[PDB]
Point group: C5
């Protein structure tokens, strides 16, 4: 829709945005115990009685950042991002109150199992597609979650009638919303999933890696209304309590985004 | 062999095709429960009584897309659409972040439900004609007759546990060709690019990625992409991400959809 | 061979396309269990280690006759190869008569465990070195296998007195023959092994990868007597029967080899 | 903050710093048994009674190295600083893990190998022109560090520290004192440090390690500028956990290895 | 050594080809258990940790005499190296523990992998570092170990060094490359641990490893000697009763050298 023209050169043609997003694993109140974890996971008796408890399901983190006001028009173009998962070293901890190895003599189980890492940087809200492992999942224990008002069998595949935009932090469940690959022309997203039961988390952290956000035409996300949208989720595994009760553990993500002025029609 | 000449230049010389294919794990009716999963897996008592139930077998997804028409067949040259590149992603990976479904669970019924896990199989193909298939099976005696909508050879022979070039097909129907007995024919498919991976074992962690930033070049070593015969683009895939483990241990394949964004350009060829 | 200039122009290039079926031990395409070994057995002791007939994988190999060409002569020079394992999707099968997960309610065990993948392209037979995990292994249950006529302790390491050439399909056991790194000047070989008991097979297939066969001097394998030699082995794991009996499973390999005419001195 | 100008050329415009850092797994006294290991790991009865024993928790290794002294003044138009260009770093003693006869739990009904050191791996190093800047973040905000008053931890605890609370920061200024479990590199700072880290978790996971003397890590940033050494100090930090030793009765200790560094530095003119 | 120009022309190049057999503990090609260690034993306590004779792997090493030659020295430019006999691990019928209630495959050789090689113009320089400072090596007086033991050797104590001057004698468990020296050697190593871990191995004759440093200079062969060192552990053989032995494989080397003028 936007006809892109030349870069604006010279002084004040560049700016940087720095932020972090804290994890939204389910206990999302920084004043309460278990912050940065989910509530204890529960398991449906049957697929038609699959009703997660309030706070046991991870959601996307997201923010809109206001950019410096500008005026053809000029827009901020996101060129690149340096992003890191924060607190990886916190997983070097095997003395927490957990199940333990070797007949109660060995280490406590570290946080381990399923990893899920995604981030997105764009010039408008991340566009979502609904897709679930169980179309019958009942989200009514927590009315602050944003989910479709109707359920249908077809949502176990891609039904393009079920879409959304990621416009609220800590509200859109990761289990039923993914990036919409048919849209997001003005957003870059990257994600990975490593599953299984007790799988080793495999994580890296460095301040030396720059991710280029320019597309194949050399154009980055263009920030509509001078808003920059950043979204993520970083699940690093489960904490296994003494009795076998399990909670998701998430970590924060840091972003340093470089933007430049771009003339558009 | 098509003799390739120059690229056609100018504003109308490029087009893009966008589509998705839903998974064909065995329950392939979007109006019914268990859509995007297989029916429960069953296990043969013996190799001569190996008869999968209807709906327990994954099949390839496929579509033919009609491209913009390009009419003179009496000239020295013709124009064809050439597929240059594709951006393709597995959709709904985040749906696997779910451990509260009605499943077997960890740690003496106190821990998480088992996530979808185990065997992964991922393949896609983009070509200017149907994907050409070779028959090869783990069990030549497999009996597919519980589901007469599957496309399989009418005769069975011991040699089909290896490569018998008398047993070939083309992928011409969505949700009908079992992945277990049909693979890409490497002796053909000159006008298709295919990429596949398999990670097996029992409860193996799925390892998946999704991004809208990766472009797969479809040009061959001579700089020529698939040429779309009869202005048809053929897209095929399969994306198994593991098994759902029910409370009693019963298991079903789980598949995910795949998205494709294909860039094509006009190419002059000799007629 | 003293190598001279490339021959240019029309008909200076040719391609050879073939497949090799796996030689896991049941190597008769008319019989049940083709593409698998016979059931694996285990030695009572290292001094009585006698594999049953058909339980041991062997190399696949072929010599392909090239177009006749022939002071100087012309030889075919192998430039590159596109090679793929065929039938990987056949491993998406968990309903065969196998051991199964979760108290006989879950999937059948897929083919899983040890993987071994190697291919070689050369202008003469692949040169082999003998090396075994057990110098005492007794191969006499199958007199069609090619093994050294005498055994010695030292063959658990590299004893250069024990060599061979891969001249017969389905006959040289992989367990005791490997490529001889001190020879094979006119062959390129590539291999990998992933072991363990029930290890996930990790496999790829594509028609988009070209392997260059030219050496560091820009010279490919030169085909002596207009013969191209192709060898491989592709073990993708074990099939686990209901009672725990196991068989190797192998898959075929496809090859598309590009060759060019090269002038050499006679 | 520092405006970088041209490289200084000529004699003594280059210098190299070579050092090693020994691991700080918890038994950090080279004269005592169990050096290079933690004390035995213990497990909290509950999250509000989570008090690691003295010596059971790994800390960062760190040193400040004096560089050849340069002029510092407020009057001169330019100054010279040392710029770290590159580092060659390796984990030392990887082959020490080829040992399965130590007094450990063993495989196959007491007939097989002793368990090798295995499990959790954590590897990080940093090279900078000032102390590594740390962010506090913990798996348990209530962790009680009072069994060892030599550890540097925040004096106040709060629920928010299970995420990123930017009010809780520090600088890595003491060897063997900052727990890895609650301090990580602060990504919002460290403009003048390069750091690299990895974690591989799980219970008995195979350690996967490499060692070579052939790899040079470039420390220049995207603008071609390396860490600039304030007060002619070079700061080197690391941690290298290679797993756990499993005693006969199942008691477990962290095992760490030393890290070697060879850092090349050059003189850089900066605006004063 | 002040390095000057390359010598050009015919006979300015030579190649050295060799293999080294593994030194897993039984190192005599005429005797039982060749190419394996003796059975692994386990210390009752850390102060009674005394490996049996032959149960511990050592480095393989050789010094190769080069053609006799300001002065001229041989400079090692590159090496092609491969582990030999990888296919020997495709064997599950040996007398071993077996899967599935005595019906399944014999356990393949599996577990710990350790692979290192070094090429240099002088002996590989070693640093002592051990998991247990008290380890008692006196069951085998042919091993080269320090004469004194000290607590500090569980870390890096630079007072404990050596040079790899004898094949089949320096235990891998207590000697590693000294990163503070070895300016005239290139070394590469990896370790994959755990209990029953799958060996992951490759072999090809198509890979050349460049030995030149960042200044374009390869190892310079002092006294016309080329030093080659390695170790290649591919796992453990698990006997019927659970007794385990290290298994090693040989390594092949093809080294290209060129004449270099030096002051
Ligand atoms: Cl100065
Ligand atoms: Mg040095």
């Amino acid at each position: 829709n936007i006809e892109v023209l030349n870069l604006v050169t010279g002084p004040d043609s560049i700016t940087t945005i720095e932020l972090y997003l804290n994890t939204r694993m389910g206990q999302n109140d920084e004043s309460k115990d278990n912050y940065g974890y989910s509530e204890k996971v529960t398991v449906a008796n049957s697929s038609d009685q699959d009703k997660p408890t309030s706070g046991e399901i991870p959601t996307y983190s997201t923010a809109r950042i206001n950019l410096p006001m500008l005026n053809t028009l000029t827009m901020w173009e996101a060129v690149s991002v340096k992003t890191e998962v924060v607190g990886v070293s916190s997983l070097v901890n095997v003395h927490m109150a957990t199940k333990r190895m070797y007949d109660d003599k060995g280490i406590g189980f570290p946080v381990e199992g399923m990893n899920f890492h995604m981030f997105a940087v764009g010039g408008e809200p991340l566009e979502l597609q609904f897709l679930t492992g169980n179309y019958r999942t009942d989200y009514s224990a927590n009315d602050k979650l944003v989910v479709p008002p109707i359920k249908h069998q077809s949502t176990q595949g891609l039904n393009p009638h079920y879409k959304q935009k990621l416009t609220k932090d800590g509200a859109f469940p990761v289990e039923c919303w993914c990036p919409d690959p048919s849209k997001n022309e003005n957003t870059r997203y990257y994600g990975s999933y490593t599953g299984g039961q007790s799988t080793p988390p495999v994580l890296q952290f460095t301040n030396t890696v720059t991710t280029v956000l320019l597309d194949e035409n050399g154009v980055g996300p263009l920030c509509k209304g001078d808003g920059l949208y950043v979204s993520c989720c970083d699940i690093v595994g489960f904490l296994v309590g003494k009795d076998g009760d399990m909670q998701y553990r998430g970590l924060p993500r840091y972003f340093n985004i470089l933007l430049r002025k771009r003339t558009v029609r």
